[PDB]
């Protein structure tokens, strides 16, 4: 039941990590970028980046590294996925055909173990004698490399220290030695160990376990010169090597937390540091000599190189140019300069790559010609982040999909569209630092400030007592605004500001009651740090005309309205485990009609006519029906299977789609017409599919064109989903015969196609969580079907051996690469 088809309409654009090495050839410098489940290899050309390959391997990238084990040339790659699917890769080129061969592979999961909250650590021994994985608490997996462990057989070493922040290997040691900082009630201590494969256990460390700054987070291993390691904390940088211990506390890095680092030169004299807020510094080592075997540092010095995007990884590639792999914003290719630019910044940007980033909300809006509905997404966060306009094709630019950026320099959160005003109601919020006694100040010129009109809400409500005492000097308080942005020029027309410490939760655009005018309904919640659960909120309404806004109604709600939708002729809101239906009177004032309490926080709220889907964050999903002849909500069915959950959508009156923990997709079907009342009162879960992406928002509509084949289209309905890594996927519904045919196609393709890392596709797509791991049912991996046409004709012949099926699904007539090609090329048009 509930046969569905999911296809990636846009590959993820957020990078997890990038490495500089010699993967392709010994004489070439390669940059490897890991956009979640997409590994791309580029070659530096001293004038830019030359793409050389891209591989969509079956899984995320928990860790990736490059190492040359001295057994051969051309370097080697190591990949470990979120499902613990470690593999070793080699870039084997054959004349013109480029291939990624797998030297060895293996699943490195432990049967029983709680994953560490810190996360996966993937260190590689500099001598390539071993690789060390920190996957679970109190354990340290080790994989030796001796050309024998082709099955990636690892052994776990017990570790006394449970809470480990970061681990690294030490350069220049006769035996593999690791160093790591850990936390105990005494504080943070930097310990070291000498891991030996002879006894399959640890040994004594080269030096002691002295205490470090309480916020020590980074461990860096400088190369053979200078020996030792460097500990980076919130406000102190220390260097330890045996007896030597040299610590500095520069005030420049005190502002933020260092979260990115790497080497600059093979000698390790210089290091690049990226911080939480996007600033980039450069740390120096003095390389002081006194005699043979200098192994000394005179002192450490850092300098603010400049400001870039919020870095997730940094690689100094070629010279001067450094690739800042941002994840919240768009990755850049800025170039270092030895001299300042008359502004104190040594960095100049020369190339930026698109990154839809978070995609916190979406809006499928049909611009100019009807049918060709473009998409508007609220990408990024903080100074990064913009309105992204995605249009499929051109009817000039030559690209399959064109992306237009409208920077806002603040984090947008929600978006709606208004035909009448031809405008965009984008919610947004900026960060302001409180003054000594002033009402906070900005940090950048943001969209909510640089606007044509800048009205501010001055409601008299909420005059009760509060204690902002907590508002010390450095206190990043969020100021929330509603921005009316022009459809055509995408210039912020209006920048309405909400009340202080008021959180604008939800926003919608509708036309309530018999009134012809359309309004932006914004539901906001009064929030205070003292109060754990908000108790006051307001539903305000705005009308935009003549380049101005006007609060024509504002209803107190005594709660925290989370999401509002336009029930036909009315306003369906969710306040606090209550779903209320507001009526629009002829006096221009909301009037409550009926409120139904469902004992769960109604975060997600969707409508399908008279049916209302209500969903809690912890998978609690229930159905309601509004009976017009009475005016009250009756609960139809519910489903409580406690699990984390991010979004919902109503595919049709019976199937409901949603996301779930560990980047999963689930479809629950209301079977109905059951023999027993209690059986038909419970929604039967049908579809499970490990998507591998954190789905953030759902939106009905398609980006291709309007109904072309009318009812002859095999796919019924089509929704789009936007995620955190930037993928914008598409989900459709199919028929039983097509589902069976495509599932047989999927099985045979898995049989014939060769993945990267020899990872089974069935295991990769299997619904994975901590409770259990069921195989994927009810979903068709559209990427596999679309890749079916990308293989050679002999492979197509091998995959159609005794299929039958084929044309018209009649008389089981034998298959050929004429209708299978036809069905595949027809399916590749829905997106």
């Amino acid at each position: 039941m509930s046969y569905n088809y999911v296809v990636t309409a846009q590959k993820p654009t957020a990078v997890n990590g990038c490495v500089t090495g010699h993967f392709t050839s010994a004489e070439d410098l390669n940059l490897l970028i890991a956009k979640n489940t997409r590994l791309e290899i580029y070659v530096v050309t001293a004038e830019g980046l030359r793409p050389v390959k891209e591989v969509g391997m079956y899984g995320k990238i928990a860790v990736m590294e490059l190492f040359r084990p001295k057994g051969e040339s051309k370097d080697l790659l190591f990949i470990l996925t979120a499902k613990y699917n470690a593999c070793i890769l080699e870039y084997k080129q054959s004349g013109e055909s480029i291939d990624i061969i797998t030297r060895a592979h293996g699943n490195v999961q432990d049967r029983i173990g709680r994953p560490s909250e810190t996360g996966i650590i993937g260190i590689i021994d500099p001598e390539c004698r071993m690789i060390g994985l920190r996957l679970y608490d109190g354990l340290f997996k080790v994989i030796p490399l001796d050309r024998d462990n082709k099955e990636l057989k690892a052994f776990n070493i017990r570790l006394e220290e449970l809470h480990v922040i970061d681990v690294k290997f030490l350069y220049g040691c006769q035996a593999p030695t690791i160093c790591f900082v850990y936390q105990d009630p005494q504080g943070r201590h930097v310990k070291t160990y000498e891991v030996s494969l002879r006894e399959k256990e640890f040994n004594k460390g080269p030096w002691k376990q002295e205490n470090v700054e309480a916020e020590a987070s980074m461990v860096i291993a400088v190369p053979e010169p200078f020996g030792g390691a460097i500990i980076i904390g919130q406000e102190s940088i220390t260097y330890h090597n045996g007896d030597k211990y040299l610590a500095i506390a520069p005030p420049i890095i005190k502002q933020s937390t260092i979260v990115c680092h790497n080497r600059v030169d093979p000698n390790g004299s210089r290091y690049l540091l990226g911080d939480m807020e996007g600033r980039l510094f450069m740390l120096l080592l003095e390389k002081e000599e006194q005699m043979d075997g200098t192994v000394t540092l005179k002192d450490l010095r850092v300098e603010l190189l400049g400001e870039t995007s919020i870095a997730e990884c940094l690689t100094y590639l070629d010279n001067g140019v450094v690739f800042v792999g941002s994840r919240l914003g768009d990755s850049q290719l800025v170039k270092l300069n030895v001299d300042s630019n008359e502004q104190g910044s040594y960095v100049v940007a020369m190339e930026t790559f698109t990154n839809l980033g978070p995609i916190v909300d979406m809006c499928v809006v049909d611009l100019e010609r009807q049918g060709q509905g473009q998409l508007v997404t609220c990408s990024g966060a903080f100074k990064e982040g913009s309105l992204r306009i995605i249009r499929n094709g051109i009817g000039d630019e030559i690209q399959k999909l064109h992306i237009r950026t409208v920077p806002l320099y603040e984090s947008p959160r929600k978006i709606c569209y208004q035909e009448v005003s031809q405008c965009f109601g984008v919610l947004s919020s900026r960060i302001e630092v409180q003054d000594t006694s002033g009402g906070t100040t900005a940090l950048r010129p943001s969209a909510s400030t640089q606007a044509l009109s800048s009205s501010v809400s001055s409601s008299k409500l909420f005059s009760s007592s509060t204690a902002p005492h907590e508002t010390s000097f450095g206190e990043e308080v969020e100021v929330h605004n509603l921005l009316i942005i022009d459809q055509h020029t995408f210039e912020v027309l209006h920048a309405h500001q909400f009340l202080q410490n008021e959180y604008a939760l939800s926003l919608v655009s509708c036309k309530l009651g018999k009134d012809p005018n359309t309004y932006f309904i914004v539901g906001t919640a009064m929030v205070y740090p003292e109060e754990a659960e908000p108790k006051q909120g307001r539903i305000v309404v705005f009308q935009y005309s003549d380049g101005k806004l006007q609060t024509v109604a504002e209803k107190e709600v005594k709660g925290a309205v989370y999401s509002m939708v336009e029930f036909n002729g009315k306003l369906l809101a969710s306040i606090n485990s209550t779903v209320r239906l507001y009526e629009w009177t002829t006096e221009k004032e909301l009037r409550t009609e009926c409120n139904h309490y469902n004992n769960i926080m109604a975060l997600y709220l969707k409508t399908k006519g008279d049916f209302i889907l209500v969903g809690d964050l912890m998978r609690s999903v229930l159905l309601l029906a509004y009976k017009p002849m009475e005016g009250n909500f009756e609960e139809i069915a519910r489903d409580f299977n406690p699990n984390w959950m991010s979004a919902v959508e109503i595919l049709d009156d019976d199937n409901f789609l949603g996301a779930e923990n560990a980047f999963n997709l689930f479809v629950c079907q209301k079977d109905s017409a059951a023999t027993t009342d209690e059986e038909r009162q419970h929604l039967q879960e049908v579809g499970l599919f490990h998507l591998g992406e954190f789905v953030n928002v759902f939106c009905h509509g398609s980006l291709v064109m309007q109904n072309l084949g009318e009812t002859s289209t095999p796919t019924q309905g089509s929704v789009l989903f936007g995620t955190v890594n930037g993928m914008i996927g598409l989900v459709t519904s199919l028929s039983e015969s097509w589902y069976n045919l495509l599932l047989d196609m999927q099985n045979r393709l898995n049989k014939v196609i060769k993945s990267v890392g020899k990872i089974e596709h069935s295991f990769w797509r299997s619904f994975h969580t901590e409770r259990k791991t069921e195989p994927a049912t009810g979903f068709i991996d559209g990427d596999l079907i679309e890749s079916f046409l990308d293989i050679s004709r002999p492979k197509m012949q091998e995959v159609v051996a005794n299929l039958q099926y084929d044309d018209g699904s009649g008389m089981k007539r034998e298959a050929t690469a004429d209708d299978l090609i036809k069905v595949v090329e027809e399916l590749t048009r829905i997106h």
């Binding site: 966060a381 923990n661 980047f663």
Partner: protein
């Protein structure tokens, strides 16, 4: 009224016959989602939740045969949560394992002074009536589902080093340590900016924040409670607070049906914030006491399970002041219960029925002084309290 005296350890000891308990502390674990046959001990009508300690006195020869049969066996026996008392109306229960047993066989009859403790919850599959001496039921064990941190999904890998933070500066000596909670939220839940929800909403689903919110109100109930007594694990903490909730059977079974610890903490907090007045079971126009008079006198909390010397379990609730209550008996210590506090039967003026006891310290210099011992069954909380 808040003066601290006498040690809360004594009521938990159940000083009813002295010492020399079985005290095996061997425990037992059962595979989750499995189907086990387990004997159901009858005439023990009460809702038992895991971690709670249940004293028992047995007089029926069938029940003492049951006690022996368990004493050679793994001694885990079912305690059904009777939704309706009509016959059984049983769908869920709770296994309880023996940890304290003695036998005296006073006079020519036999007596059992077994003390047990709940271990696991289950859903009843086949009640049946085999072994007509003692009913055995085949039940399916409900698994304990534990969820990972809600921020583990987004997984900002670079920020992962910042997920570990220094411990609480001091337990409660410093008020600025409340800013630590304000700083804890900003650090742990920073990656919420990649989602569609604010930071504070995710804090409404964090186990640690919910545990601290309950702990703050528990210390409001008992200034002497202090730290180091409540369990650190969210699962055990949720069960412990569920023991000390003056709720009716329908709410109790609602709490028992909840599987995830976070859901239990959220609903426990909501009840603990809403229900602020308890009326009589039948005459709801009584309003015996409000929320502001509850205080704990034992490590288990303000609420505990005790048994009178008749086999009848009484889920008493310690409370400072009780109105519209008239004493019936006289202050005779008789049974130990609370050591040296005596007991007088109490009744509500409107309704001629038992409500609880009144304990008055016999030494005249004990801080608890005079308090009330209302029972769960005789009290009916009201959600609106209006």
């Amino acid at each position: 009224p808040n003066i601290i005296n006498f040690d809360t350890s004594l009521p938990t000891s159940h000083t009813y016959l002295g010492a020399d308990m079985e005290e095996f502390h061997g425990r037992t674990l059962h595979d989750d989602d499995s189907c086990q046959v387990i004997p159901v001990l009858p005439q023990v009508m009460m809702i038992l939740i895991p971690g709670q300690t249940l004293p028992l006195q047995l007089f029926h020869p069938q029940e003492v045969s049951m006690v022996r049969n368990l004493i050679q066996k793994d001694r885990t026996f079912a305690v059904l949560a009777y939704s309706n008392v009509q016959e059984r109306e049983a769908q869920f229960g709770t296994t309880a394992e023996i940890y304290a047993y003695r036998e005296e066989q006073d006079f020519g009859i036999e007596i059992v002074k077994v003390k047990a403790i709940g271990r696991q919850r289950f859903k009843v599959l086949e009640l049946r009536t085999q072994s007509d001496g003692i009913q055995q039921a085949k039940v399916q064990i409900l698994p304990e589902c534990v969820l990972p941190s809600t921020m583990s999904a987004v997984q900002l890998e670079s920020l992962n080093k910042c997920q570990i933070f220094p411990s609480k500066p001091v337990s409660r000596e410093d008020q600025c340590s409340y800013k630590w909670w304000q700083k804890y939220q900003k650090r742990k839940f920073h990656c919420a900016n990649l989602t569609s929800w604010p930071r504070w909403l995710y804090s409404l689903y964090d186990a640690e924040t919910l545990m601290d919110r309950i702990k703050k109100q528990l210390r409001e109930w008992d200034e002497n409670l202090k730290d180091d007594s409540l369990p650190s694990n969210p699962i055990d903490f949720s069960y412990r607070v569920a023991a000390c909730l003056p709720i009716d059977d329908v709410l109790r079974i609602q709490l028992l049906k909840i599987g995830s610890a976070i859901q239990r903490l959220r609903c426990e907090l909501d009840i603990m914030n809403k229900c602020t007045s308890l009326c009589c079971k039948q005459c709801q126009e009584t309003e015996i006491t409000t929320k502001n008079e509850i205080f704990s006198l034992s490590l288990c909390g303000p609420m505990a399970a005790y048994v009178n010397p008749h086999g009848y379990v009484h889920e008493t609730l310690t409370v400072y002041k009780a109105c519209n209550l008239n004493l019936i008996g006289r202050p005779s210590t008789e049974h130990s219960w609370f050591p040296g506090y005596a007991w007088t039967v109490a009744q509500c003026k409107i309704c001629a029925s038992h409500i609880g006891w009144k304990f008055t310290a016999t030494k005249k210099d004990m801080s608890p002084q005079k308090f009330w011992g209302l029972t769960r069954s005789a009290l009916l909380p009201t959600i609106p309290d209006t």
